[PDB]
Amino acid sequence: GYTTGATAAAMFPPWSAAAGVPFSLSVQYRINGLGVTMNVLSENQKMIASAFNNALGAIQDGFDATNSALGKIQSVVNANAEALNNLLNQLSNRFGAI
Amino acid sequence: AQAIEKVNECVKSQTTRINFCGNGNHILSLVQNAPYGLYFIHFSYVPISFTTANVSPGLCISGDRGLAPKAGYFVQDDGEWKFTGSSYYYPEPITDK
């Protein structure tokens, strides 16, 4: 809920909690440190959003393959599991001789 | 705390520091809750179709507007002198200010 709260804090360009600035405006400003406001023409705003559409679907579609983002996640839940198995096999190790 | 820094500075607000939480530029930032730690989507900005043009940055050459040691400005020709940002090749009207 909070992540949705975090995300939709930008998704209401009427009233937004990402520095108070509207979102469709906000895509034209982090570019404007590098790109030019005249250059996006308001044209590439639709093209970046269509690419953002093309991002988010391919974000969904590229996720099903073995991705780097899944990579560390499967590692750490294994890095937990290898630790506890080393902790559990420890219980039956016969330190003393009997 | 690196994540706290990223959710406070990359996610929530905008950036004035450049090379933080990724590479290149940072167009947007998102956040989705993932198992055992949240994870983001750093929407980086990648150009494709490169070109070329002559450029003379320091204005060591050919003052037309009288006594111009102006600076801070890129160069392409065929206008008089034009400024381009470091992403999109485009002539301005004039230099910035």
């Binding site: 949705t4 998704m11 009233w15 979102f23 469709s24 639709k46 953002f52 996720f63 | 989705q32």
Partner: peptide
């Protein structure tokens, strides 16, 4: 988060209602 909350997009940046939590269940 003002309730007066609807589940469709209004800004033109698409799927931000769809990909808001579709990426959740894939994880």
């Amino acid at each position: 988060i003002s309730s007066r909350s609807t589940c469709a997009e209004d800004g033109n940046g698409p799927s931000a209602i769809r990909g808001r939590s579709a990426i959740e269940d894939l994880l």
